[PDB]
Design a protein around this ligand. Structure first.
Ligand SMILES: *[C@@H]1O[C@H](CO)[C@@H](O)[C@H](O)[C@H]1NC(C)=O
Ligand SMILES: *[C@@H]1O[C@H](CO)[C@@H](O)[C@H](O)[C@H]1NC(C)=O
Lengths: 284, 48
């Protein structure tokens, strides 16, 4: 069972320029002190990405598409963003995939979920902070895949400190194989506007032979309710300050400068400006 | 299948983790990525 949510404020989506972001190891082979040309799916350089903010209450939970893999960045302090749903119809007519970082485990479910139009993120927070209600879906008919990771404890306490979490993820889905690359970094005390410059390489983390079709994806949030949030089951809640940036991948040819330990110290595109193309064709 | 011993510097056929090849298997002191176990060079030949 589910209920339609209300009291939402509409804001146009902002756009921000990406500064040397979205570079990952494409294969499982180690190289040292080389300049390697890789023709794979990357995020185009200096392409701009979509911005979403959550704190009106700024309820930003839209339905974004999934073309050829997705670059998802999140500036966060208290693990507000938890879950990730993927599917084609999300009404039990076709198989759907779900990742939930709840209190129990990191649950991955490939099931025919009859997802609600506006699935709640209940996580009823009493004096202690756990999850007490679950209204993400209603029922599953007959599914294929269930996986539960290692059980670990999580706090959920309402930390309201400075921004010290920057999480970058890359999603691919090729030939029925779903691949997650990731990189988590503690960002220093810094102005909370956009993603700084610099470089980072995303080590591959997860490969799953799901073999299903994904067209649309949606993120989830962690709403907190206390004596300061009066209302019914879908009116009074607290979100907290967090933001997330979304970008889409394209097939491009890059040149990566492997350092002399094995990590990608620098990368250059080969279709941005004529200087980049000259560097690519001269391999320097 | 089987689990054999380790051979020091000597010309020997090897099938390291299902990698058929022939050559001296000497010790190496190059740091590795804890997600990849292969290794290549400028000519793209298996080396480590
Ligand atoms: C950013 O991308 C959007 C995508 O539609 C485009 O409209 C816009 O011109 C781009 N540049 C800027 C500066 O927003
Ligand atoms: C690894 O990187 C740093 C400097 O780049 C240093 O420890 C060393 O030169 C490199 N190689 C190693 C540790 O084998």
């Amino acid at each position: 069972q589910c209920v339609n949510l209300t009291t939402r404020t509409q804001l146009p989506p902002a756009y921000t320029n990406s500064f040397t972001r979205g570079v990952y190891y494409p294969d499982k082979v180690f190289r040292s002190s080389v300049l390697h040309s890789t023709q794979d799916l990357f995020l185009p350089f200096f392409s701009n990405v979509t911005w979403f903010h959550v704190i009106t209450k700024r309820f930003d939970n839209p339905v974004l598409p999934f073309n050829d893999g997705v670059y998802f960045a999140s500036i966060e302090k208290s693990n507000i963003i938890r879950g990730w749903i993927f599917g084609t119809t999300l009404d039990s007519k076709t198989q759907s995939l779900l990742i939930v970082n709840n209190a129990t485990n990191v649950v991955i479910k490939v099931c025919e979920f009859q997802f609600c139009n506006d699935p709640f993120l209940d996580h009823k927070n009493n004096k202690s902070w756990m999850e007490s209600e679950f209204r993400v879906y209603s029922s599953a008919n007959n599914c294929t895949f269930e996986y539960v990771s290692q059980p670990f404890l999580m706090d959920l306490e309402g930390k309201q400190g400075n921004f010290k979490n920057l999480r970058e993820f890359v999603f691919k889905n090729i030939d029925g194989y779903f691949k997650i690359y990731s990189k988590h970094t503690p960002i220093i005390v810094r102005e909370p506007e956009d993603l700084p410059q610099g470089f980072s390489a995303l080590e591959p983390l997860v490969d799953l032979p799901i073999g299903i079709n994904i067209t649309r994806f949606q993120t989830l949030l962690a709403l907190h309710r206390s004596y300061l949030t009066p209302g019914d089951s879908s009116s009074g809640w607290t979100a907290g300050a967090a933001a997330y940036y979304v970008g889409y991948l394209q097939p491009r040819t890059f040149l990566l400068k492997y350092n002399e330990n094995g990590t990608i110290t620098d990368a250059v595109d080969c279709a941005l400006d004529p200087l980049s193309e000259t560097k690519c064709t001269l391999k320097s | 299948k089987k689990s054999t011993n380790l051979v020091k510097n000597k010309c020997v056929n090897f099938n390291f983790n299902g990698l058929k090849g022939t050559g001296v298997l000497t010790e190496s002191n190059k740091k590795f990525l804890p997600f990849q176990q292969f290794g290549r060079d400028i000519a793209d030949t298996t080396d480590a």
